[PDB]
Amino acid sequence: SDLHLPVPGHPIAAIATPVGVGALAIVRISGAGVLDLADRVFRKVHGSGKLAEAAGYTAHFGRLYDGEEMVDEVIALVFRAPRSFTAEQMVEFTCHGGPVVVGRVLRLMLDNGCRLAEPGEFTRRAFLNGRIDLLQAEAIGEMIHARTESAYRTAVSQMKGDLSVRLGGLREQLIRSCALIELELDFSEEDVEFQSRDELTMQIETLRSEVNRLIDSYQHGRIVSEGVSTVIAGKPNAGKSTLLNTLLEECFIHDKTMFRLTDMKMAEADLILYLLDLGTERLDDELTEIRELKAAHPAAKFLTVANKLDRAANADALIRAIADGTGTEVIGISALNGDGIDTLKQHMGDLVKNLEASVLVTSLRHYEALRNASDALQNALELIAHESETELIAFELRAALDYVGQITGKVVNEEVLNTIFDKFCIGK
Amino acid sequence: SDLHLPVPGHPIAAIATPVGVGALAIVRISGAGVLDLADRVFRKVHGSGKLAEAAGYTAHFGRLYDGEEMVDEVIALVFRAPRSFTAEQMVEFTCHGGPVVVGRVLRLMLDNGCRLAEPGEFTRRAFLNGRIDLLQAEAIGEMIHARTESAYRTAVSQMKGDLSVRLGGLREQLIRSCALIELELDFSEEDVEFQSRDELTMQIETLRSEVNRLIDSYQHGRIVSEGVSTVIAGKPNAGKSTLLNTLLEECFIHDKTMFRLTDMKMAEADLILYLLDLGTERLDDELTEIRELKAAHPAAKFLTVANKLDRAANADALIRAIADGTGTEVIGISALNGDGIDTLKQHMGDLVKNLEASVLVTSLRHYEALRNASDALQNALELIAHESETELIAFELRAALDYVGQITGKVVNEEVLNTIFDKFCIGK
Ligand SMILES: Nc1nc2c(ncn2[C@@H]2O[C@H](COP(=O)(O)OP(=O)(O)CP(=O)(O)O)[C@@H](O)[C@H]2O)c(=O)[nH]1
Ligand SMILES: Nc1nc2c(ncn2[C@@H]2O[C@H](COP(=O)(O)OP(=O)(O)CP(=O)(O)O)[C@@H](O)[C@H]2O)c(=O)[nH]1
Ligand SMILES: [Mg+2]
Ligand SMILES: [Mg+2]
């Protein structure tokens, strides 16, 4: 008396809650005959309402047993048909939040038939069984690892599938535009007035500024996703390490904007901070060195940071000097002393303000595939203006559509799937 | 159509799962009209099966809303009458395991009527409403924070209430022994043969070796609970910091035995490690200094650790020398080099093996109250041998019983309750 559920994978197990101490922790398992396996270690307190023959979304209070030995007191939640995260049947034992206990709970599952889950495997299965699309599966991981109000908020928008509905809108627009020329190529004498060429050139143009708008989102969305890549550059003993350490590879947040610190990825960095040992630099007229870097990366925002302000006497004349002979803005700093750092950050968070309500695109795969989508759309657009064969024009619209589908996983790669889900923590 | 449930406290909220990133996290709330409050932020997906009118141990899939804004997609578990951790009605929203998300979920509960839970408040309420006794409430916290197989296993035994049944056994034995003399003090002429004095002296003696056995458990159980307090002592520049750091206040585990490292708590320390700069010590015949410390703490195990074995040439003759002129065992070590540390630990874990199946007592409150219990039992025991008034004898048995009850919370203190539950993490 059952339906057409997706064939479930081998039973897997992992700890779903963070590592550390806490009141509670979750170990979750999913796959084929998972609750039958759970039944063999879980003892319901009262009678013996078998876990396997239980309804979906029902909690059960009891104990996990390793034969004679008690493991913990747990609540066991039963997920049923397609109605669960992985769309296969799963059970999540929520238990006492101790490393030793939770670890011992995991091994009980492993020793009893579960293979340990692989990075992202849970979320992957969600995508693979069609409960989630590749965008939403990306959004889940992004929401967990998010470090900003904006980062979190964007993940929510995407996990809802705001981008996804926006794309399915273009998907069906391309399908409509695609099938117009594919009717011109059935032909044989089929000229039914109501022109094909004019009606389509616009259909492509509507779809192009549609896609181009989304391409511009990345400009901003990248900063939302992974912050502002900032490089601290200087000299031997300018105080780079001491600045990096007091500010917190690893990174900090300030005024709801994330900053990615690092130490070669100089080119392609949004903000360059040049640190010099104020006065104490043995050869000081190396503000040519700081002028050259500013001239070497015009794409970046630049700030000169005069460090060790506490060792230096009259600093106002030295700051003004450096500012003059480089044509940059200079901020006075003491890195070990932590002096005026809050001035530095208030300045740091200023070109990171870039030139409204609308859907964003995070990290470049979506971006890159949207570019190719645009190119093909514009190849097709130009191809009409040059009066070329329908075969070639319809063949670009196919390419465009294939790229758009690429981002929602419509066209699977299973190597793209890996570079995505390898970043995922073991347990979804 | 309801029962006699304990009056529930003000609605509280806290994050129940560890801090960090993970697939899932739990925010839990408990108190008066908690699910009514939950109903005001949680939207069930399908129709509108109100959370308040739902059955116990039933999960509900939906979304948390902050008015118009979505907060997360959650499963909401409903706990009902006395059937929950705190015995009051509670709900645990299990949601996406991101710091930003989980944090935003907590504030939604707080902004909607919940006061933030206090350290241990959840487990305290468990005890206060009588679902758990003070021993079991102690065991819960101990199981979470445990760092050893033994530590964890002992917590399980106690959370079951193994000690608790063992005590309730003495509780009713004292009640029986207490009421025997209290019948002698009703008297007026009541000498009903079947002697009172002989039958009771043994009843006290049975109960005394009963209690004394448990007092001896602490000797061992303390080491199980908080490991072996080990002090690394030396000289200016003997390499104490470098040894401490490579070995890992904070502490390490080795061969299923926990070691508590530290740097005055010299007296009352199980293991003393004396570290000296092998050879390089400017005045070396300061092995008198190391002999004096061994003679100053005979209660401890002692090991001399000859550090910086890598700088020193012929070390075997220097080690043998130090070993001779101090009467201690000497282990050769290089702290930065990490050389023969595994030999040191194999030696460290040797007097930490102390002179079988039976119930243990962890940290001294139980220990101390069991001492007083024994004293009073033995005061009463001696008092019979000295033929003193029944009033005085019955008054010691009362004192004994009161001490035994003290450990299971039978006699509340609410300042003892604080020093216990202040150690607890916010959220049980
Ligand atoms: N007075 C003062 N001294 C500083 C300050 N910052 C660093 N120093 C001194 O200068 C040294 C700089 O060390 P560090 O912070 O590692 O600078 P660095 O540029 O990373 C060294 P490298 O070029 O090798 O990476 C420190 O050892 C410290 O004594 C400061 O803000 N004020
Ligand atoms: N060759 C060698 N040198 C060491 C070793 N351990 C420490 N040193 C050297 O001796 C110094 C000892 O520093 P430290 O480890 O802090 O010893 P300490 O006894 O804690 C210093 P204090 O007495 O001030 O606490 C180090 O700076 C290091 O250069 C070792 O195992 N081998
Ligand atoms: Mg450095
Ligand atoms: Mg030191």
Residue numbers in the entry:
A (entry chain A), B (entry chain A): 4 to 251, 270 to 284, 305 to 396, 401 to 473
Can you list sentences taken from the study reporting this PDB entry?
MnmE is an evolutionary conserved G protein found in bacteria, fungi, and humans, which together with the protein GidA catalyzes the formation of a carboxymethylaminomethyl-group (cmnm) at the 5 position of the wobble uridine (U34) of tRNAs reading 2-fold degenerated codons ending with A or G, i.e., tRNAArg(UCU), tRNAGln(UUG), tRNAGlu(UUC), tRNALeu(UAA), and tRNALys(UUU). The crystal structure of MnmE from Thermotoga maritima reveals a three-domain protein consisting of an N-terminal tetrahydrofolate-binding domain, a central helical domain, and a canonical Ras-like G domain inserted into the helical domain. On the basis of the common feature that the G domain cycle is regulated by homodimerization, MnmE has been categorized as G protein activated by nucleotide-dependent dimerization (GAD), together with the signal recognition particle (SRP) and its receptor (SR), the regulator of Ni insertion into hydrogenases HypB, the dynamins, the human guanylate binding protein hGBP1, the chloroplast import receptors Toc33/34, the septins, and the Roc-COR tandem found to be mutated in Parkinson disease. The X-ray structures show MnmE to be a constitutive homodimer where the highly mobile G domains face each other in various orientations but are not in close contact as suggested by the GDP-AlFx structure of the isolated domains.
In the case of CtMnmE·GppCp, the crystallographic asymmetric unit contained three protomers (chains A, B, C). Molecules B and C form a dimer within the asymmetric unit, while protomer A forms a dimer with its crystallographic symmetry mate. No density is found for the G domain of molecule C, but crystals applied on an SDS-page confirmed an intact protein (unpublished data). Thus two dimeric structures of CtMnmE·GppCp were analyzed, i.e., the dimer generated by protomer A and a symmetry related chain A (termed “dimer A”) and the dimer generated by protomer B and a second protomer B docked onto chain C (termed “dimer B”). Crystal contacts of G domains A and B in the CtMnmE·GppCp structure comprise areas of 845 Å2 and 987 Å2, respectively. Docking the G domain of molecule B (or A) into the asymmetric unit of the CtMnmE·GppCp structure to the position expected for the G domain of molecule C would create a much smaller hypothetical crystal contact area of only 18 Å2 (or 131 Å2). Thus we would expect that the G domain of molecule C is present in the crystal but, due to its high mobility and absence of sufficient crystal contacts, is not visible in the electron density map. In the crystal structure of CtMnmE·GppCp this loop region is not resolved underlining its high flexibility. In the crystal structure of GppCp-bound MnmE the G domains are found in the open state, indicating that this equilibrium is shifted towards the open state under the crystallization conditions. Moreover, for CtMnmE we find different orientations between the GDP- and GppCp-bound structures and even between different molecules in one asymmetric unit of CtMnmE·GppCp.
